[PDB]
């Protein structure tokens, strides 16, 4: 049981990984993508991508 | 007669809030019929995702 927990806190932990920021000004990629302009979203994923 | 430094400019300020909440001013889309049981691309009330 403990290693299957142990897996699952891992697994979980990188799903909810996602909605952290990281500093963009958003966290769901279309809306990011769906209000700004090519050369002024591109910085913006590319840090949530890294 | 004054110069340009001084002459009055009109400003306005458009604070729009993008938010979670129900939106109640937006574009002239022609906002049409959904389909369902069969998976689309929508914009969904700018949720855009499929």
Redesign the interface.
Known sequence: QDVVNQNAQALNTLVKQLSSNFGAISSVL??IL??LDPPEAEVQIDRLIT | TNGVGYQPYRVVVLSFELLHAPATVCGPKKSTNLVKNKCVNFNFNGLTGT
């Open positions: 279309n809306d769906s209000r």
